[PDB]
RNA sequence: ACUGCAGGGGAGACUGGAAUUCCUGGUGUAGCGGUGGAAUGCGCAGAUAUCAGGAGGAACACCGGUGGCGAAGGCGGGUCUCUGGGCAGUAACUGACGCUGAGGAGCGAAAGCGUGGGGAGCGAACAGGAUUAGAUACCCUGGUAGUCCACGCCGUAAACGGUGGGUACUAGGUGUGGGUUUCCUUCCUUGGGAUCCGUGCCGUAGCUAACGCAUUAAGUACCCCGCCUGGGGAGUACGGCC
């Protein structure tokens, strides 16, 4: 999932400075793409219990970067939730 | 009253019995005299001696239908397996080739449970 | 556009004249969807190793197509319904 | 000692039923790894070329 | 797709209904509707021959084309999938490309807007009708006719399908939904696919009146009768009926097919 | 993040051959089967055997190992579609975002349960034969549920390495699985040296009541969690939750 020419468009919109692969904006952006991509794989294929566990590792990793980005700057946190979604 | 010059002999040798049938190359039985036909009953049928009398009673009754040369297809995990090929030779049959056609499944059907004897 | 490779086994009672026009109507479902067909090599008659549906001979054709993933699953659906075809084995080439 | 690691870019192919005459025995069965000298990775490719070549009937499942 | 009601009343404690999730356009086509009227089981003499019939809800006959002989090569389009109170399946309104409207029994997986071919050059997709000569062996078919051009008569309830075993020279062998291996002619026509609405056998009709609407009038047992009325009747308390089980007309149970019927030469194996 | 790489890791659809069983037909005729020894049973209304054709279900010989993968339960006929994780290298990026986790939530062999399909082989229950003082058993011949599929429930195993997770350190010898990289390097040997990640055997310090463990610790230390407090009564009662 997420070929190398498909992750570039997500890094151009949420990354900070043209090489940013590591910041919490660019990682919540990529992990929200993979969570959304893997939920179509779970609408068809209900019984894929071994890919659904990889979903909960990505969910738990995204929530820790949300928790981190809501501690160092509350302004970056609001302008990232509104572009993707909470609840 | 038949006359076929070349034949095929099938020997099924199990742990309880042996059966020697002799066919034509199309697979049609001439004579089949086994280890219970030759007079035996019980555990004696699985001995090597009853195999070398089963193979004689099928050999010299295939010759009354003119069979002068057989091919040998043996199958089964039995004791009487070499003593029925050597017994077709000393009854007037040329044996030629000997092949093993033991039915070997590719782990298909499930075997019965093991014996707690 | 994934590189595929399709092996077809044809009925031996067809000559080598009505083979390249025969599957040409099958290979037009690739071209009308945007695919490419590269090499439609024909091996000819060959002795089968075992009896495939009361036949001991067969005509071996190798297709070597490069198309979409949903058009090759359409191509072997139509080949497996034609009575000229015995087997089909669709294999990819890359990793 | 392994032919496929020594001589590079020799593609194990299920079409190639002349390379697959060796690595199978006289009864048609796949040879063991210790009698051919292959590595683990190329024994997997040989044993996949043979199973495919039996389905397009280039090799027999059994023979006597 | 069988919805279960909540136990709000003593008559819906286990009831269920079809979900009707496939029906579009809840009204029928006007020109393909003929009238009907119930009989109550009465024949031309006015007497009950089939017991336990009557009551009922008013119906109208939808004209189902079971022939499909004379539109070979004219493609059609499924306009709607509708309800039909006469049969257990659902019906499908085909708009042919020349202008005629027809209904067919809907195969499983024939959603709205498809294309249905017919004739000897059709594709083996669900919905298409072909002669049995052109269907490959192993394919699940439905609505098969017995004689060439005589109309579809086999396997046309909800869920039912025939498996085409093999074709020898001039006769095809069929496995039918009872297990009965039958041999029919190869110029007979059959629709590729299995009949839809396959979940309707699981419907728990909840109350007694819900079978009165569908037409079933109550069935009384013979053992609570009098000996003038039934062979089982009598007995001072309650009995099993002091004889072997029979019909109300004194016929013993057992095989009732005619022993030398003309179609015995087409039946390979009786059902189990 | 980029670049390479290994694999029975998972789910869906179509599909391949050997064999077991039954059916139709040919040849054939008097036994087959079974055991420590036998009988019940099948057969003489044409069995077993043997050749040809067909129907159907389940399991996948050889490769296959001391080996690979997965958090564990577990996972191997082939191909296609979707999809999870790991290792190495570069050091491009964020800049402590890390560890554990009370309650909670998901997953969790087999047997079993619900509705609906399927049913070859095996086979709890059951029936007969045998053995026996008896034989509600072992053994034999039959055989239902179940084993299989779709969807739910259950939530237990000697679920085991009887050894919770993270981290640092503390002699080596020798096999093996996955990478990367200098030297006589293309004299091929895929041999040797170095290094990171697994998986085994043997072994010093150290520990242990002993057996034993030993760089994959049960050693030397730190952080978080569950648990134990004599054997029975008992993982039972009562109450509650499911
Ligand atoms: Mg490989
Ligand atoms: Mg009148
Ligand atoms: Mg009635
Ligand atoms: Mg009364
Ligand atoms: Mg009275
Ligand atoms: Mg009266
Ligand atoms: Mg009376
Ligand atoms: Mg009474
Ligand atoms: Mg009474
Ligand atoms: Mg896999
Ligand atoms: Mg499944
Ligand atoms: Mg078979
Ligand atoms: Mg059967
Ligand atoms: Mg017979
Ligand atoms: Mg037979
Ligand atoms: Mg598989
Ligand atoms: Mg900086
Ligand atoms: Mg935790
Ligand atoms: Mg807890
Ligand atoms: Mg569960
Ligand atoms: Mg189970
Ligand atoms: Mg029960
Ligand atoms: Mg069940
Ligand atoms: Mg059931
Ligand atoms: Mg038993
Ligand atoms: Mg008993
Ligand atoms: Mg426990
Ligand atoms: Mg275990
Ligand atoms: Mg424990
Ligand atoms: Mg520890
Ligand atoms: Mg190591
Ligand atoms: Mg040791
Ligand atoms: Mg200790
Ligand atoms: Mg105590
Ligand atoms: Mg309790
Ligand atoms: Mg209680
Ligand atoms: Zn190699």
Residue B33: CB atoms within 10 Å: 21
Q: Which helix (H) or strand (E) holds A53?
A: helix A52-72
Crossing angle of helices A24-40 and A7-14, in 10° steps, is 140
CA distance between the termini of chain B? 51
Min Cα separation C95/chain E (Å): 33
E179: its two tokens: 């297990």
User: What are the backbone angles phi and psi of residue E114, rounded to the nearest 5°?
Assistant: -80, -175
Quickly count: other Cβ atoms within 10 Å of residue C8's Cβ: 27
Residue E193 CB partners (closer than 8 Å, separation 6+): E107, E108, E109, E110, E125, E126, E127, E140, E141, E142, E161
Picking from E116, E35, E28, E127, the residue whose alpha carbon sits closest to that of residue E80 is E28
On chain E, the residues whose CB falls within 8 A of the CB of C84 are: none
Say how far apart CA C22 and CA C84 lie, in whole Å.
Answer: 9
Q: How many Cβ pairs within 8 Å bridge chains C and E?
A: 3
The gap between A81 CA and F144 C1' (Å) is 63
Nucleotides of F under 7 A from a protein CB: 1-3, 5-12, 14-20, 26-39, 48-52, 54-64, 67, 70-73, 77-85, 92-98, 106-108, 115-117, 120-123, 138-140, 151-152, 177-179, 188-191
The answer to whether strand F lies under 7 Å from the CB of residue A86 is no
Which residue is it, tokens 């042996």?
B18
Chain breaks in chain C (C to N over 2.5 A) after: none
- Rounded to 5 degrees, what angle do the CA atoms D19, D24, D26 make? 120
Give E39-99 as a DSSP string: -TTB-TTSSBSS-SB------EEE-B-----S-TT--EEEEEEE--TTSSS-EEEEEESSS
- Rounded-to-integer distance, Cα D44 and Cα D52, Å: 12
Whose tokens are 């022993």? That residue is E259
Contact E171, E177 (CB under 8 A): no
For residue B27, give every residue at least 6 positions away whose Cβ sits within 8 Å of its Cβ, in sequence order, or none. B8
Cβ atoms of E85 and E56 within 8 Å: the answer is no
Quote the CA–CA distance of B3 and E207 in Å, as a whole number: 80
DSSP structural state of residue B83: T
For residue B10, list its beta bridge partners. B21, B73
Contact of E97 with E75, CB cutoff 8 Å: yes
The alpha carbon of E199 and the centre of ligand 22 are apart by a number of angstroms equal to 27
Q: Are C82 and C11 in contact (CB under 8 A)?
A: no
Q: Among positive and negative, which fits the CA dihedral A67, A70, A76, A77?
A: positive
Locate tokens 């032919």: which residue?
D3
Other C-beta atoms lying within 10 Å of the C-beta of residue A46: 8
Kindly give, in sequence order, each residue whose CB lies less than 8 Å from that of residue C37, ignoring residues fewer than 6 positions away. C27, C30, C31, C63, C64, C65, C66
CA atom of C43 to C1′ atom of F90, Å? 48
Q: What is the resolution of this structure in A?
A: 2.8
Cβ count within 10 A of residue E264:
10
Gaps in chain E with C–N over 2.5 Å, residue before each: none
Residue showing tokens 């109507």: C25
Q: How far is CA E161 from CA B64, B67, E130, E194, in A?
A: 57, 54, 15, 5
> What distance in Å separates the CA atoms of residue E66 and residue E76, rounded to the nearest whole number?
15
Which residues 6+ apart lie within 8 Å of E68 measured at CB? E104, E118, E129, E152, E189, E191
CA E211 to ligand 3 center in whole angstroms: 12
Distances (CA, A) of D38 to C20, C73, E161, E203: 41, 35, 52, 62
- The C-alpha atoms of residue D9 and residue D3 are separated, in whole angstroms, by 11
- CA E41 – ligand 17 centroid, Å: 92
> What is the number of residues in chain E?
272
> Strand F: which residues 31-90 of B lie within 7 A (CB)?
31-32, 34-37, 41-46, 73, 75
Structure tokens at E200: 């309707």
Strand, helix or coil at A3? coil
Rounded Cα distance between E82 and E156, Å, is: 16
- In degrees and rounded to multiples of 5, residue A68 shows phi and psi of -70, -40
* Rounded Cα–Cα distance for residues A80 and A30 (Å): 13
Structure tokens at D31: 């040879």
Residue B52: other Cβ atoms inside 10 A: 22
Q: What is the distance in angstroms between the Cα of D50 and the nearest Cα belonging to chain C? A: 13
What is the spatial distance between Cα E62 and Cα E91, in angstroms, rounded to a whole number?
9
The answer to whether E119 touches E101, Cβ cutoff 8 Å, is: no
Strand-strand pairing, E33-35 and E60-62: antiparallel
3-state secondary structure of B80: coil
* b/e A62-84 (16+ beta carbons within 10 angstroms → b): beebbeebeeeeeeebeebeeee
CA dist., res. E77 & res. E99, Å (int): 11
Q: Nearest 5 degrees, angle CA C19-CA C24-CA C26? A: 105
Q: How far, in Å, CA of A28 to CA of C29, rounded? A: 42
How far, CA to CA in Å, does E13 sit from each of A66, E16, E134, E203? Answer: 49, 9, 50, 13
Rounded Cα distance, E272 and A13, in Å = 69
The Cα–Cα gap between B95 and B55 comes to: 12
d(CA A11, CA A7): 6
D26 has a chain B CB within 8 A of its CB: no
Nearest nucleotide to D5 by CA–C1' distance? F190
C1'-nearest nucleotide to the CA of A23: F94
- Residue matched to tokens 């566990």: A53
CB E204 within 8 A of CB E190: no
> In sequence order, what are the residues at sequence separation of 6 or more whose Cβ sits closer than 8 angstroms to the Cβ of residue E150?
none
**Ramachandran quadrant class, E249 (left: phi over 0; alpha: psi -120 to 50; beta: rest):** alpha
What are the beta bridge partners of residue E21?
none
Ligand 28 centroid vs A49 CA: distance in angstroms? 20
Nearest to D50 by CA among D19, D26, D4: D19
Which chain A residues 18-77 have CB under 7 A to strand F?
19-24, 30, 34, 37-38, 41, 45-54, 57-58, 64-65, 67-68, 72
E197 neighbors E88 (Cβ within 8 angstroms): yes
Query: Could you tell me the strand order of the sheet in which E101-105 lies?
Result: E101-105, E91-96, E76-82, E115-116
Residue D13, token pair as written in the block? 């192919």
* Residue C9 with chain D: CB contacts under 8 Å: 56-57
Which 3 state secondary structure label does DSSP give C66?
strand
E189-192 vs E129-131, strand pairing mode: antiparallel
Specify the length of chain A in residues: 87
**How was it solved?**
cryo-EM
């Amino acid at each position: 999932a997420l070929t190398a020419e498909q992750k570039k468009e997500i890094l151009r919109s949420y990354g900070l400075h043209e090489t940013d692969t590591g910041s919490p904006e660019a990682q919540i952006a990529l992990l929200t793409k993979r969570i959304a991509d893997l939920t179509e794989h779970l609408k068809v294929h209900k019984h894929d219990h071994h890919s659904r566990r990889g979903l909960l590792l990505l969910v738990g990793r995204r929530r820790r970067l949300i928790k981190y980005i809501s501690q160092i700057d509350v302004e970056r946190y609001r302008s990232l939730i509104e572009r993707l979604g909470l609840r | 009253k038949k006359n076929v010059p070349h034949g095929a002999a099938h020997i099924k040798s199990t742990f309880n019995n042996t059966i020697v049938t002799i066919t034509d190359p199309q697979g049609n039985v001439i004579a089949w005299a086994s280890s219970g036909h030759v007079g035996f009953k019980g555990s004696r049928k699985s001995t090597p001696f009853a195999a070398q009398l089963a193979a004689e009673n099928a050999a010299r009754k295939a010759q009354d239908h003119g069979v002068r040369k057989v091919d040998v297809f043996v199958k089964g995990p039995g004791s009487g397996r070499e003593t029925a090929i050597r017994s077709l030779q000393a009854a007037g049959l040329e044996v030629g080739a000997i092949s093993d056609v033991t039915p070997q499944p590719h782990n298909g059907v499930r075997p019965p449970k093991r014996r707690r004897v | 556009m994934r590189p595929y490779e399709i092996m077809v086994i044809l009925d031996p009672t067809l000559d080598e004249r009505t083979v390249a026009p025969s599957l040409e109507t099958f290979l037009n479902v690739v071209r009308k969807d945007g695919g490419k067909v590269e090499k439609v090599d024909i091996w000819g008659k060959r002795r089968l190793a075992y009896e495939i549906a009361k036949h001991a001979e067969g005509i071996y054709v190798v297709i070597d197509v490069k198309a979409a993933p949903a058009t090759v699953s359409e191509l072997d659906r139509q080949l497996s319904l034609n009575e000229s075809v015995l087997r089909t084995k669709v294999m990819r080439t890359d990793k | 000692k392994c032919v496929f690691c020594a001589k590079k870019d020799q593609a194990i192919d299920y079409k190639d039923t002349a390379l697959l005459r060796t690595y199978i025995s006289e009864r048609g069965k796949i040879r063991a790894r210790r009698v051919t000298g292959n590595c683990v990775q190329h024994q997997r490719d040989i044993a996949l070329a043979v199973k495919n070549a039996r389905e397009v009937a280039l090799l027999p499942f059994t023979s006597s | 797709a069988i919805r279960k009601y909540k136990p709000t009343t003593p008559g819906r404690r286990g009831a269920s209904v079809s979900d009707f999730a496939e029906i579009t356009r809840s009204t029928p086509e006007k020109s393909l509707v003929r009238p009907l009227h119930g009989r109550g089981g009465r024949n031309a003499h006015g007497r009950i021959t089939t017991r336990h019939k009557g009551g009922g809800h008013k119906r109208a006959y939808r004209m189902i084309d079971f022939r499909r002989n004379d539109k070979d090569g004219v493609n059609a389009k499924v306009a709607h999938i509708e309800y039909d109170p006469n049969r257990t399946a659902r019906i499908a309104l085909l708009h042919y490309l020349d202008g005629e409207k027809r209904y067919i029994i809907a195969p499983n997986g024939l959603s709205q807007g498809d294309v249905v071919e017919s004739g000897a050059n059709a594709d083996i997709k669900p919905g298409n009708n072909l002669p049995l000569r052109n269907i490959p062996a192993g394919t699940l078919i439905h609505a098969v006719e017995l004689r060439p051009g005589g109309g579809a008569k086999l396997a046309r309830s909800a869920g039912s399908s025939i498996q085409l075993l093999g074709k020898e020279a001039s006769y095809a062998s069929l496995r039918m939904p009872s297990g009965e291996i039958r041999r029919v002619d190869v110029r007979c026509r059959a629709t590729v696919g299995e009949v839809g609405n396959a979940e309707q056998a699981n419907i728990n009709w909840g109350k007694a009146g819900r079978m009165r609407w569908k037409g079933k009038r109550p069935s009384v047992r013979g053992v609570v009768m009098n000996p003038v009325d039934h062979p089982h009747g009598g007995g001072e308390g309650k009995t099993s009926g002091g004889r072997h089980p029979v019909s109300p007309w004194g016929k013993p149970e057992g095989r009732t097919r005619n022993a030398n019927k003309s179609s015995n030469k087409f039946i390979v194996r009786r059902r189990r």
